[PDB]
Design a protein around this nucleic acid. Structure first.
Length: 88
RNA sequence: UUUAGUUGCUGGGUAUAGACCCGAAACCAGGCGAUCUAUCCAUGAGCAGGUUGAAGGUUGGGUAACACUAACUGGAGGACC
């Protein structure tokens, strides 16, 4: 799992302003870090469906935020997906 | 109570022997054969030419990851002509 320091580094890197924790960039980066972290758990616990539901919820939330950001500003969307490595 | 036998030689018959001659399928004992053939052991040799295209591998697409998937390779088989 990730710690407060790890989350703070991501927030500081992707923040668009001072004390900015609500921007789509920050939210999507946090969700991406959490999703990449959980892949290790689901490798050793393949039959844990109850947690996989929460993982799917994280994926859906990331998709919705990405679509909203693409609608608001295309340049920011491309920059964020490039910085995070997401294919879409 | 019956009062001529016996020993030779020749001949007829019988018995024991192959016993008038020829003829089995068999049974038993001791030896000879695996240069043919059956199986096995050791050491060598042989199988023109042409098809089909298993496993495996690489790359790409796809997925939140897995799945799934296309092409290229690869050369299996009591496989095919």
């Amino acid at each position: 799992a990730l710690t407060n320091a790890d989350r703070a580094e991501i927030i500081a890197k992707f923040a668009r302003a001072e004390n900015d924790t609500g921007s789509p960039e920050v939210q999507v980066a946090l969700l991406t870090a959490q999703i990449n972290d959980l892949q290790g758990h689901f490798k050793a616990h393949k039959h844990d469906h109850h947690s996989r539901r929460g993982l799917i919820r994280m994926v859906n939330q990331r998709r919705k935020l990405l679509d909203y950001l693409n609608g608001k500003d295309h340049e920011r969307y491309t920059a964020l997906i490039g910085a995070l490595g997401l294919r879409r």
